[PDB]
Amino acid sequence: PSRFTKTRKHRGHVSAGKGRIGKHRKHPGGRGMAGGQHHHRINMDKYHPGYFGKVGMRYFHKQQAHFWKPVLNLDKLWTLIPEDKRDQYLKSASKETAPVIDTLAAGYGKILGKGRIPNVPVIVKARFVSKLAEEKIRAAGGVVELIA
Amino acid sequence: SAQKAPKWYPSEDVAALKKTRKAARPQKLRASLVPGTVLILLAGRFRGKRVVYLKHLEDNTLLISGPFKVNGVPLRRVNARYVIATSTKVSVEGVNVEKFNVEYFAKEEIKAERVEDQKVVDKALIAEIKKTPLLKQYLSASFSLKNGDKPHMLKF
Amino acid sequence: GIDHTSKQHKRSGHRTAPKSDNVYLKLLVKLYTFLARRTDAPFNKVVLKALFLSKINRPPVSVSRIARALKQEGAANKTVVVVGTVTDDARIFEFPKTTVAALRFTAGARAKIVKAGGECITLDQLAVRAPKGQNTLILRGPRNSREAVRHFGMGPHKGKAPRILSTGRKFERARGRRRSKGFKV
Amino acid sequence: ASLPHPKIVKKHTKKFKRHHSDRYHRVAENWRKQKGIDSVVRRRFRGNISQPKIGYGSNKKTKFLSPSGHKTFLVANVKDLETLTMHTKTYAAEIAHNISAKNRVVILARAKALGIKVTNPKGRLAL
RNA sequence: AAAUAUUGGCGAGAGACCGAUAGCGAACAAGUACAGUGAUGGAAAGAUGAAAAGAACUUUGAAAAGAGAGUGAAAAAGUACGUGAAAUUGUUGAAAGGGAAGGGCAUUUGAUCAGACAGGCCAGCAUCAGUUUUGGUGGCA
RNA sequence: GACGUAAGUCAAGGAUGCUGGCAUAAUGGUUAUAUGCCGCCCGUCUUGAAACACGGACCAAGGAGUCUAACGUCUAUGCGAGUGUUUGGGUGUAAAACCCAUACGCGUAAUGAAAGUGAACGUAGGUUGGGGCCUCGCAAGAGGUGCACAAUCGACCGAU
RNA sequence: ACUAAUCGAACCAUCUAGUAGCUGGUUCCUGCCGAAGUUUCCCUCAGGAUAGCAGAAGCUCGUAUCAGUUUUAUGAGGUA
RNA sequence: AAGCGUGUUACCUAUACUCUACCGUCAGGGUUGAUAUGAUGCCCUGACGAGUAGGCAGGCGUGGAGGUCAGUGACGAAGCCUAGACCGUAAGGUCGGGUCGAACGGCCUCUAGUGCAGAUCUUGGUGGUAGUAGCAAAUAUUCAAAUGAGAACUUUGAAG
Ligand SMILES: [Mg+2]
Ligand SMILES: [Mg+2]
Ligand SMILES: [Mg+2]
Ligand SMILES: [Mg+2]
Ligand SMILES: [Mg+2]
Ligand SMILES: [Mg+2]
Ligand SMILES: [Mg+2]
Ligand SMILES: [Mg+2]
Ligand SMILES: [Mg+2]
Ligand SMILES: [Mg+2]
Ligand SMILES: [Mg+2]
Ligand SMILES: [Mg+2]
Ligand SMILES: [Mg+2]
Ligand SMILES: [Mg+2]
Ligand SMILES: [Mg+2]
Ligand SMILES: [Mg+2]
Ligand SMILES: [Mg+2]
Ligand SMILES: [Mg+2]
Ligand SMILES: [Mg+2]
Ligand SMILES: [Mg+2]
Ligand SMILES: [Mg+2]
Ligand SMILES: [Mg+2]
Ligand SMILES: [Mg+2]
Ligand SMILES: [Mg+2]
Ligand SMILES: [Mg+2]
Ligand SMILES: [Mg+2]
Ligand SMILES: [Mg+2]
Ligand SMILES: [Mg+2]
Ligand SMILES: [Mg+2]
Ligand SMILES: [Mg+2]
Ligand SMILES: [Mg+2]
Ligand SMILES: [Mg+2]
Ligand SMILES: [Mg+2]
Ligand SMILES: [Mg+2]
Ligand SMILES: [Mg+2]
Ligand SMILES: [Mg+2]
Ligand SMILES: [Mg+2]
Ligand SMILES: [Mg+2]
Ligand SMILES: [Mg+2]
Ligand SMILES: [Mg+2]
Ligand SMILES: [Mg+2]
Ligand SMILES: [Mg+2]
């Protein structure tokens, strides 16, 4: 909606809000990131430190599918059970009939330990797990199975 | 429609006036204005005429009869702010003036009631005017400002 | 001439009305404008101001956050008031039976409260059963957890988050960020 | 007659004509603010034209009223004229410029039947 | 082979597009008229009226044409044609004018103009209220 | 508030009463002129413009912060630990409207150059404030609880 | 010097709406607030970034924290 | 002294100060068991008002789009002219009269190729200058008749 812009409001005023001294010009400081080491150095060091220079080692032909391992914290583990069956599993926290949670199907690689699952045994299947996450699972009476 | 409508309209109910604290108290005339003083008429068809002040009417006017037999000014009203009260005096306790009020001078040739009243009123007036000399001539003469007359330092 | 100590014709800087044209919110403001004026309870004046707040100034209040406010001693029977959205939380497993008054409940939040025996209430139903805010509890969400706040006051040695589109190695982890490359922040 | 009103005060009856619109033909009289750096009118030098200011705004109790004391309502037809049936002391009707001559007699005859003052009753009138 | 592209060609349907200084350079005998040795460059230019019904005829003039008459709803539509602004111009009328003119505030004069008797315009006096100004006189320290 | 024995009255939270002339160009408006005083040509750059600085003989029409990709802050809206139908498919009154699967993007985890590892001692901590609410109080106030947020000291995760 | 009125590098079309820290212009009204020509860095001195000054949006609260001022007490200074 | 030094009074007058009104802005408040139906309304109270660059707000106008006024119009739309009238501080809106001949408005919203005095701006048109500068190199013309409305300039004859 061009009727709501300051351009409509600047009609009748000589400089269009750009100043009589500055005189809005083409590119007074350069184009793009011009002079980021010379005359834009203060801004760059203040707001984008680390911009210039190298760090670390290269990776020729990096495929991000190799580094696919989405993380599921323990406090969200029970969300992988459907809402309806979730309540009937928390009730009757059994050992001979404990839910199997295959977290790979849900789309996770590793299971982390943000913690405080209820004391209900669960058979948690995953590719990877942290040390704290399994010990909280086994504290509740469950077990971790490794899958591929 | 050329105009849509006023979204709501002002109410045409007229508001009553607030109670006013303005009581009508009687006028206090200037000290120089006592009945019997000779007045100079400052404005009107009788400009500059010397008249006799007889009564203060209830509408804040002065009832004058600059004796009609003398200078031809009848029983009439004048404004106290359009007269100059001189120092000359005549006696008034010989003329009856209760008959004259606001309704007397109400509008609605010359009525015979007014003509006969003038004869009664001036009959006692001219009798007392003859007492001291030169009033009749003074009342017939008309006042005017001469060259070198400064009313701010003149006395009447 | 007058030697002005303060700026002349300065607006207060506080919202006197909601920015929204929500018709239903405008007559929640109308109800609580009346209650604020005709009742001396400080609760009504607080609620009226909170109804003007923008979206970032009324962050969502979780049911887990509600459950924690009800664990204060003597606060388990109060009515929780949220002037904003009440969202759900799967981290909390046991939710108490309580009354919550809010502008909005998400579908997950409404189910959790009702299932635990409580009731979800609007701010007009609160006003009819707490005309002076009897035994209520005003909860506000975390205002400074917003992602835009990470970049506020960016500068050397400030520890703030740079405004950056892509993240990783080769992206502002070099000269200025470590001693081995010039200096460190 | 309309409702009683305070004596209408204008505070400025002279038209606010643009600076130098009496000097060049290309400058219309429609008011424009002088925005030049050296403009005497902008700088309010003595002896120059006045500029519209909010201080000239009319009293709210007499604003929009014509000297008849009515507010002008522009009317295109009889149905529009009816909106002022209960507002004859506050609003006077004006017939729109583009109403045909035969339609103006219908409006004028209806206006008399209800007491609405018409502010241009002589327009397009056959005599 | 298809799914892909398509400011060219052919045929279609459309638009919150432009509306004759716009929209293609070109709404029209436009890549025309015209300029350049040449490569090239390159316009301006739409609208009488429903219908020419495009003014027979008379008169003045060498004629162009004018004045009539007429056609037409209109000639305040006459192919110099829809409307017909401004700059600029003629006539008439009004006014002012000792080396500019034009402007602001106020009023005189002239011209012109709107509205209202079921109170409108302009005033005078008295008693008060608010704010002031200028005198007279009294009692005290 | 005053005066008055009351009744009431008053100059006490803002003007009333009486009277006259006219009822139209009379007042008023507009406009032209005259008179008194005042008034240098706009725009622009500039410390400074009426400038012996620059553009402007006049008039009409045209004539200059736009659109797009990506993004910051703020605001509105929908939903909300999720969210985004419109690449596609279905459908259609056919470039509309309506409906939808699987993905994908961003968010829900950080940190390290990386291999990697990966977030509760505790009522998800202690102290100091802190609106609101609760209790006792006519009230002042005292006590309890204290969300957001602010400071600080801790705990936890990655790196060293 | 001349090379079609063109010569210290012809003319024509295109790239091309070439770039310009430089010059000119930048079109309606009213209301409210309202500056800077100084700090640091820059092949920087007719330009930028930076801090400052300004507006807007507000937010948490509700008379505190305060203050281009004084007083009392207690320090510092090396100008007249 | 109508000069100089000094002293005492009176007087003059700024957009300054006091008081009042009115406009706007800001702030603090009142107002719901019909608020005598409009709560972004009505109202009470106090203070304040300079402004370039610049910011923000509220409005005015233009082309076109969705909706509505079963809106205006060949009994006259639009446009144009109008020292005629009215409303608005203003941008502007409205009305009367003249010309004209076919379409065009109000309001709620959407949209933008949306507002001109300048750019030695573009195109077009038009002025003052001004009936002015000028129409002066190349020796040179003249008389009569004819033609013709009209002959310095055509034709013929005669001369030079
Ligand atoms: Mg400029
Ligand atoms: Mg006006
Ligand atoms: Mg004006
Ligand atoms: Mg200046
Ligand atoms: Mg063209
Ligand atoms: Mg034409
Ligand atoms: Mg015609
Ligand atoms: Mg015509
Ligand atoms: Mg015609
Ligand atoms: Mg024509
Ligand atoms: Mg003209
Ligand atoms: Mg003058
Ligand atoms: Mg007085
Ligand atoms: Mg006059
Ligand atoms: Mg002068
Ligand atoms: Mg200089
Ligand atoms: Mg200048
Ligand atoms: Mg020069
Ligand atoms: Mg220059
Ligand atoms: Mg020039
Ligand atoms: Mg234009
Ligand atoms: Mg660690
Ligand atoms: Mg050559
Ligand atoms: Mg170029
Ligand atoms: Mg200011
Ligand atoms: Mg260098
Ligand atoms: Mg310069
Ligand atoms: Mg500031
Ligand atoms: Mg020393
Ligand atoms: Mg020293
Ligand atoms: Mg002396
Ligand atoms: Mg101002
Ligand atoms: Mg400005
Ligand atoms: Mg119709
Ligand atoms: Mg017309
Ligand atoms: Mg004119
Ligand atoms: Mg036609
Ligand atoms: Mg444009
Ligand atoms: Mg122009
Ligand atoms: Mg300009
Ligand atoms: Mg020019
Ligand atoms: Mg000559």
Q: What DSSP letter does each residue of A81-128 carry, written as one string?
A: S-HHHHHHHHSS--SSS--EEETTTTT-SEEE------S---EEEESE
Classified as helix, coil or strand, A146 is strand
Residues of A in contact with C93 (CB under 8 A): 78, 90, 118
- The gap between C163 CA and F72 C1' (Å) is 8
- Which sign, positive or negative, has the C-alpha torsion C20, C22, C26, C32? negative
Q: What is the CA radius of gyration of chain B?
A: 23
Of D residues 31-70, those with CB within 7 angstroms of nucleic strand G are: 31-33, 35, 51-55
Q: How far is B21 from chain D (nearest CA, A)?
A: 21
Any chains having at least 3 CB pairs less than 8 A from chain B are: D
Residues of A in contact with C177 (CB under 8 A): 49-50, 55
The answer to whether A48 CB sits below 7 Å from nucleic acid chain G is no
CA of D13 to the centre of ligand 15 (A): 26
Of C152, C136, C134, which Cα lies nearest the Cα of C144? C152
Measured CA to CA, the distance from residue B105 to residue A99 in angstroms comes to 120
Measured CA to CA, the distance from residue D112 to residue C96 in angstroms comes to 75
Of B76, B92, B80, which Cα lies nearest the Cα of B31? B80
Task: Tell me the nt nearest to D39, Cα to C1'.
Answer: F42
Distances (CA, A) of D100 to C147, D79, D105, D114: 67, 16, 9, 21
Q: What is the CA radius of gyration of chain C?
A: 22
Indicate the residue type of D99. Answer: I
CA of C8 to the centre of ligand 25 (A): 7
| Residue where the block lists tokens 């209430």 | C121
**Tokens representing residue B99 in the block:** 């008959």
Contacts of A10 (CB under 8 A, 6+ apart): A16, A17
The residues after which chain D has a C–N gap greater than 2.5 Å are none
Q: How far is B13 from chain D (nearest CA, A)?
A: 9
CA of A16 to the centre of ligand 20 (A): 27
- The gap between C163 CA and F84 C1' (Å) is 24
Q: Are B59 and B112 in contact (CB under 8 A)?
A: no
- The gap between C38 CA and H33 C1' (Å) is 14
On whether any CB of chain B is under 8 Å from the CB of D74, the answer is yes
Measured CA to CA, the distance from residue D98 to residue D73 in angstroms comes to 15
The H-or-E segment that residue D71 falls in is: strand D71-75
Distances (CA, A) of B108 to B58, B105, B111, D3: 19, 9, 12, 33
CA of A30 to the centre of ligand 18 (A): 34
Measured CA to CA, the distance from residue C28 to residue C95 in angstroms comes to 29
Measured CA to CA, the distance from residue A53 to residue C169 in angstroms comes to 11
Measured CA to CA, the distance from residue C101 to residue A114 in angstroms comes to 30
Domain positions in chain B: 6-156
Measured CA to CA, the distance from residue B87 to residue B83 in angstroms comes to 13
Of D residues 15-74, those with CB within 7 angstroms of nucleic strand H are: 15-16, 19-20, 24, 26-28, 30-32, 35-37, 42, 44, 46, 52-67, 72, 74
Measured CA to CA, the distance from residue C119 to residue D34 in angstroms comes to 65
Q: How far is D51 from chain B (nearest CA, A)?
A: 31
CA torsion angle A84 A86 A91 A95 (round to 10): 130
Q: Return the DSSP state at C134.
A: T
* Nearest listed ligand to the Cα of residue A35: 26
E-state strands within C12-165: 61-62, 79-87, 99-105, 119-121, 136-138
Of C86, C88, C89, C66, which Cα lies nearest the Cα of C78? C66
CA torsion angle D15 D16 D17 D18 (round to 10): -170
The H-or-E segment that residue D78 falls in is: helix D78-81
Q: Are B36 and B65 in contact (CB under 8 A)?
A: no
Chain A / chain C CB contacts < 8 angstroms: 62
Q: Which residue of D has its CA nearest to B13?
A: D3
**Tokens representing residue A133 in the block:** 């996450």
Q: How far is D48 from chain A (nearest CA, A)?
A: 21
Of A50, A75, A118, the CB nearest to C172: A50
Of B2, B5, B9, the CB nearest to D96: B2
Measured CA to CA, the distance from residue D91 to residue C173 in angstroms comes to 75
CATH architecture assignment, domain C14-145 = Ribosomal Protein L15; Chain: K; domain 2 (3.100)
Are B6 and D91 inside 8 Å of each other by CB? yes
**Which experimental technique did the depositors report for determining this structure?**
cryo-EM
Q: Return the DSSP state at A17.
A: T
Measured CA to CA, the distance from residue B7 to residue C51 in angstroms comes to 29
* Nearest listed ligand to the Cα of residue C8: 25
Q: How far is A23 from chain C (nearest CA, A)?
A: 30
Q: Are A138 and A74 in contact (CB under 8 A)?
A: no
Measured CA to CA, the distance from residue A74 to residue A80 in angstroms comes to 11
The answer to whether D67 CB sits below 7 Å from nucleic acid chain E is yes
Task: Tell me the nt nearest to C177, Cα to C1'.
Answer: F113
Q: What is the resolution of this structure in A?
A: 2.5
On whether any CB of chain B is under 8 Å from the CB of D2, the answer is no
Distances (CA, A) of B84 to B46, B57, B92, B141: 13, 18, 19, 15
Strand partners, C177: C184
Question: Based on the number of CB atoms within 10 Å of its own CB, is D31 exposed (0-12), middle (13-18) or buried (19 or more)?
Answer: middle
The three-state DSSP-derived secondary structure of chain B is: CCCCCCCCCCCCCCCCCCCCCCCCCCCCCCCCCCCCEEEEECCCCCCCEEEEEEEECCCCEEEECCCHHHHCCCCEEEEHHHEEEEEEECCCCCCCCCCCCCCCCCCCCCCHHHHHHHHHHHHHHHHHHCCCCCHHHHHHCECCCCCCCCHHHCCC
- The gap between B154 CA and H81 C1' (Å) is 68
Of C148, C158, C156, which Cα lies nearest the Cα of A50? C156
Measured CA to CA, the distance from residue D44 to residue C82 in angstroms comes to 56
The H-or-E segment that residue A134 falls in is: helix A131-139
Chain A / chain D CB contacts < 8 angstroms: 6
How many Å from the N-terminal Cα to the C-terminal Cα in chain A? 55
* Nearest listed ligand to the Cα of residue D98: 35
- The gap between B93 CA and F4 C1' (Å) is 37
